[PDB]
Design a protein around this ligand. Structure first.
Ligand code: 980
Length: 845
């Protein structure tokens, strides 16, 4: 390759945080084949993208303006303040005007044609043919009662986006030779055997074991394990799952490779251990640590290529049984009797898209004759292709329960029709979904590829999402690094530049973030000594190695300029994270405000990303129902290991320490303090009324959203409010109360203990409207939740843990019983009062 082609690839590694040209931990060519395989899709999308539109990345939507946002326009007239930067002239606009119509009517109303609008202070353009009402930045202003300011400047040069050119009927069997391990320290010497499973989609097809023996650094068996399943009956994407019990270690080997060739030869596999189910147990990856990790030596010998090739109406009562089956929630288990009905009737089942996950779970994947039929069945997809895209339904086909490439591919087919507004909504969960893919190159992996390359805002978050995992998952980091590399070769030198800047800042500051944790420990107090250094270090960073500006990873519209070293401070949290503030690099930025970002170590910010994302989902669901719950899913991006950044919400304080308004160094509580905090924080009386109004919506929001996610019981310390009346939860790492509805909250709604008011009626009433809107999405919520547990939490009950949300969403009831159920929850919160809050700190010491 060229000498530069290598200076290039090292650049790629520093951005990735992993070296994908490194072949030390692979027993095959799957990953390199996948690098090569992705070259076409990469090149295809770069080739098909309009350079101009790709350069300006307009953020748009096809959805109708919600009703709550139409009213906020009581004229059919929108006002745009256009600033050429000396005199700015406002304009009265129709909701249907394209950018071009206003750029046209802006030169008319001034009593060469290639000038564009910009959102003052952000890298957001209003451009392309879309009605201004369909632009996100605009809907964002209307929701917040905010003026639309646009400075007029020149379109960005697409040259900057330039991309560098490129360059048998036998029963299956496996011999288990034995297991070598460098050291075994534990306490009680025990017996150790090996459990071999044939797996397809978390379904175990066949299982065998070895004779247990004394546990030693090396154990030899030299045993052939003969399975029942015949070689031809092995489905593509079938795993050999090898586990050691006494369950200590596990490792996986794909039985059919990326060429559809059956696996043969000798294998020494380095395994994963366990801490005293979960998506990591699925990985075709081997433990990179060859020094400290159990290994297994096995043998495969068998024959070549197994490949893939190309009237009765139900009595009513059976059709009624079938229909009862399809209706059940995603978590509801299928009997043998259930599956046989679903199967025998496959042709009927095909007319019901909501039945596909159950129907495909009714397949014997261990039988080539049956799989073949399944494909014949898939061949006539008419009903599936024409159906309305159901995201929750599509998402079910991408989980750990489906290992078939054709099954998963149809789900991806249906995603193809998602426009960027919605891909952004689901990007994080789809990327996590990559983990359930049997092979590194996948239809889904390629769709994330195209979508990121086609759009910079998608590309931006794709990048960070992938880098999050690559840094923190030895399990999935190899496959992700290949996908990230694929992306980076297509995104343009412009973004390639941004990422590097972003990356430099993040390392530099993650460095500081840890060094400050190490010196100081939990008083929890902040040494004047610690503080002076925190300034010492940061100041050197500002001068010595500064990337003069950078994109804010959770808000890529915004470029942070230089730090304000004076407003920076260590946090008194328990982990001692940094509280940082930057100047905005955009001088045309309208406000004088800095950009606060909190850098922290010791939380898994990955669970927090996932949680914040589901919140952004509940919002979009309500938007479709014309609801606004005034949530505040602040930006949070995971980066390291127990490390990442978080967006500072301006003017927010903790509800706790609003309690501390009068005293604060013990506990207890007092009603009306909060409403007192509000009058005090409102400039006018009209703004105080608005604050009480906002707090009612935002409180109703976190009440419903939190209850469903089963995170509803939180310390006052984790709840925050703005000086503007907006309430929001934080720190989502991980008797009871359904949620937090306290007398201090209630007091602000105008009631103190049992009684009722005009605002308090407004609250209950919203929750119920909000609550029932979610229930319409239960399956969507259930799948998202379950996937979040598998990919995002530690080892879970992929039975019990998932269920909370089933009971929570009142699956199976009618909207009537439900409305009551939730209202009772409010009563339950009125009955605890301060009892729940009061208990934290009891065990503190
Ligand atoms: C402990 C804490 C705050 C209260 N602190 C009060 C004291 N303080 C000080 O600086 C004073 C001077 O001592 C800092 C803030 S504010 C805040 C916060 N905010 C900042 C504002 O915008 C919204 C988010 N996030 C997280 C947090 C931590 N971890 C995770 N995973 N998620 C969220 N913790 C906190």
């Amino acid at each position: 390759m060229s000498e530069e082609s290598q200076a290039f690839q090292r650049q790629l590694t520093a951005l990735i945080g992993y070296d994908v040209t490194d072949v030390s931990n692979v027993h095959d060519d799957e990953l390199e084949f996948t690098r090569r395989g992705l070259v076409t899709p990469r090149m295809a999308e770069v080739a098909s993208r309009d350079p101009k539109l790709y350069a300006m990345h307009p953020w748009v939507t096809s959805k109708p303006l919600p009703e709550y946002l139409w009213k906020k326009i009581a004229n059919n007239c929108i006002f745009i303040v256009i600033h050429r930067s000396t005199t700015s002239q406002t304009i009265k606009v129709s909701p249907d005007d394209t950018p071009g119509a206003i750029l046209q009517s802006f030169f008319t109303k001034m009593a060469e044609q290639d000038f564009v609008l910009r959102v003052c202070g952000r890298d957001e353009y209003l451009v392309g043919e879309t009605p201004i009402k369909n632009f996100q930045w605009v809907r964002h202003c209307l929701k917040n009662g905010e003026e639309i300011h646009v400075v007029l400047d020149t379109p960005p040069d697409p040259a900057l986006d330039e991309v560098r050119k490129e360059e048998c009927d036998r029963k299956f069997r496996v011999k288990i030779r034995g297991i070598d391990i460098p050291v075994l320290p534990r306490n009680t010497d025990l017996t150790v055997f090996v459990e071999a499973n044939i797996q397809h989609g978390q379904q175990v097809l066949c299982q065998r074991r070895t004779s247990p023996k004394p546990f030693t650094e090396e154990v030899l068996w030299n045993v052939w394990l003969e399975f029942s399943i015949k070689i031809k009956d092995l489905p593509k994407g079938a795993l050999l799952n090898l586990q050691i019990y006494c369950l200590l270690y596990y490792v996986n080997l794909l039985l059919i490779d990326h060429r559809f060739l059956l696996r043969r030869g000798e294998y020494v596999l380095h395994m994963w251990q366990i801490s005293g189910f979960n998506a990591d147990k699925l990985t075709s990856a081997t433990n990179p640590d060859k020094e400290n990790s159990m290994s297994i030596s096995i043998l495969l010998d068998n024959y070549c290529h197994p490949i893939a090739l190309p009237r009765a109406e139900m009595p009513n009562q059976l059709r009624k049984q079938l229909e009862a089956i399809i209706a059940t929630d995603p978590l509801n288990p299928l009997t043998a009797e259930d599956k046989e009905l679903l199967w025998h009737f496959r042709y009927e089942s095909l007319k019901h898209p909501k039945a596909y996950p159950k129907l495909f779970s009714s397949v014997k994947w261990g039988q080539q004759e049956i799989v073949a039929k399944t494909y014949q069945l898939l061949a006539r997809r008419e009903v599936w292709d024409q159906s309305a895209l159901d995201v929750g339904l599509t998402m079910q086909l991408l989980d750990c329960n489906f290992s078939d490439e054709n099954v998963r591919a149809i789900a991806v087919q249906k995603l193809e029709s998602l426009e960027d507004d919605d891909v952004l909504h689901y990007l994080l969960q789809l990327v996590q979904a990559v983990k359930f893919e049997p092979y590194h190159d996948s239809a889904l992996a390629r769709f994330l590829l195209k979508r990121g390359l086609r759009n910079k805002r998608i590309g931006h978050f794709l990048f960070w999402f992938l880098r999050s995992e690559i840094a923190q998952s030895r399990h999935y980091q190899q496959r992700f690094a290949v996908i990230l590399e694929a992306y980076l070769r297509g995104c343009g030198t412009a973004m390639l530049h941004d990422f590097t800047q972003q990356v430099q800042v993040i390392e530099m500051l993650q460095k500081v973030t840890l060094d400050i944790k190490s010196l100081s420990a939990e008083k929890y107090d902040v040494s004047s000594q610690v503080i002076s250094q925190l300034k010492q270090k940061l100041e050197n960073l500002q001068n010595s190695q500064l990337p003069e500006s950078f994109r804010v990873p959770y808000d890529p519209g915004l470029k942070a300029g230089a730090l304000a070293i004076e407003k920076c401070k260590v946090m008194a949290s328990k982990k001692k994270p940094l509280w940082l503030e930057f100047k905005c690099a955009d001088p045309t930025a309208l406000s004088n405000e800095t950009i606060g970002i909190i850098f922290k170590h010791g939380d898994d910010l990955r669970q927090d990303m996932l949680i914040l994302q589901i919140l952004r989902i509940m919002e979009s669901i309500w938007e479709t129902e014309s609801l606004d719950l005034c949530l505040l899913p602040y930006g949070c991006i995971s980066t390291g290991d127990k490390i990442g950044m978080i967006e500072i919400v301006k003017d927010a304080t903790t509800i706790a320490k609003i309690q501390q308004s009068t005293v604060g160094n013990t506990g207890a509580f007092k009603d009306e303090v909060l409403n007192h905090w509000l009058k005090e924080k409102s400039p006018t009386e009209e703004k105080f009324q608005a604050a009480v109004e906002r707090f009612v919506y935002s409180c109703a929001g976190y009440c419903v959203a939190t209850f469903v996610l089963g995170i509803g019981d939180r310390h006052n310390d984790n709840i925050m409010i703005t000086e503007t009346g907006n309430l929001f939860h934080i720190d989502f790492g991980h008797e009871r109360v359904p949620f937090v509805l306290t007398p201090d909250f209630l007091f602000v709604m105008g009631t103190s203990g049992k009684k009722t008011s005009p605002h308090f009626q407004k609250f209950q009433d919203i929750c119920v409207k909000a609550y029932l809107a979610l229930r319409h999405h239960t399956n969507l919520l259930i799948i998202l939740f379950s996937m979040m547990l598998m990919t995002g939490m530690p080892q879970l009950t992929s039975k019990e843990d998932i269920e909370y949300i089933r009971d929570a969403l009142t699956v199976g009831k009618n909207e009537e019983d439900a409305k009551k159920y939730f209202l009772d929850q409010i009563e339950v919160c009125r009955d605890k009062g301060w009892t729940v809050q009061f208990n934290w700190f009891l065990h503190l010491v």
